Amino acid sequence: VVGGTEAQRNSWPSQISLQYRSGSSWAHTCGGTLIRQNWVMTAAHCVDRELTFRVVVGEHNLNQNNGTEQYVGVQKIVVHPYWNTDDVAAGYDIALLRLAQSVTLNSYVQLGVLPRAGTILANNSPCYITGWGLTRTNGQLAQTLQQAYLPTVDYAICSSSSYWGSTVKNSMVCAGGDGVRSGCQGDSGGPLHCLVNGQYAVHGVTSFVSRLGCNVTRKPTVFTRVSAYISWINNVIASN
Ligand SMILES: *[C@](=O)([C]([N]C(=O)[C]N1C(=O)C([N]S([C])(=O)=O)=[C]N=C1C1=[C][C]=C([N])[C]=[C]1)[C]([C])[C])C(F)(F)F
Ligand code: NA
Secondary structure, three states: OOEEEEEEEEOOOOEHHHHHHEEEEEEEEEEEEEOOOEEEOHHHHHHOOOOOOEEOOOEOOOOOOOOOOOOEEEEEEEEEEOOOOOOOOOOOOEEEEEOOOOOOOOOOOOOOOOOOOOEEEEEEEOEEEOOEEEEEOOOOOOOOOOEEEEEEEOOOOOOOOOOOHHHHOOOHHHHEOOOEEEEEOOOOOOEEEEEEOOOOEEEEEEEEEEEOOOOOOOOOOOEEEEEHHHHHHHHHHOOO
16 A cells, blocks of 8 residues: 555454465465455455465554464365456456465454445546555565555546546556555555445455556556455355
8 A cells, every 4th residue: 555554453354365375474465455364355366376375354563573463275266257367457357265274353354345236436536445555665574554545436437538537447446546555566456445324345456557556546456346246255155
């Protein structure tokens, strides 16, 4: 997260750290959202490889042990069938991970609230991106969870020529683009939390930013619109 501030340790309890094993160690690669005690929602481009993954819930400081973490292995990975490996621009950037064990909910670990199917937000709706991604283009990962205020940019403006044009589809949500704050490498797959009816709901899965830079003016961070996928999500969970 670029242009962000450190989050309180109990502000966003649904946020998870998706890690893969490098050698004998583990490295953070993407964010994710706890949606069931044994299911995690993230981006398809994060689990697109035959890597060994694990999820860390109740995490705040990537390097230090906070005394609140739960490390769980990933039993199965369901990528959306229409996801095309290269194409982040084509859409369908979403996947679900069945955890090998059900995690314990407490004040540092809670389930994310999903929106009602088809829900579209008004322009400039108040949302926050969270993550341990790069704090600067070509910089390094944050050690502690960062958050940044990223209001939405509705489809009409986002798909216009001065913004993302045809690259952005209706199954995506745009947020930010002020040239100061944005998502950045390592935030991928994590949540876009939006205040709706006095309640914070996860409306997006972090997908992409400008190849030319993370905080580029008029190049908002783009997310997979969760509300466009409520039926798929429920079908996967119900079926396996
Ligand atoms: C995420 O943390 C990271 N996501 C990406 O970098 C996704 N991404 C892009 O933003 C582009 N930029 S674009 C649309 O070409 O202007 C291109 N490719 C990717 C991408 C595709 C596939 C894979 N496996 C990885 C990256 C944040 C910027 C949100 C990630 F990817 F690093 F984990
Ligand atoms: Na930690």
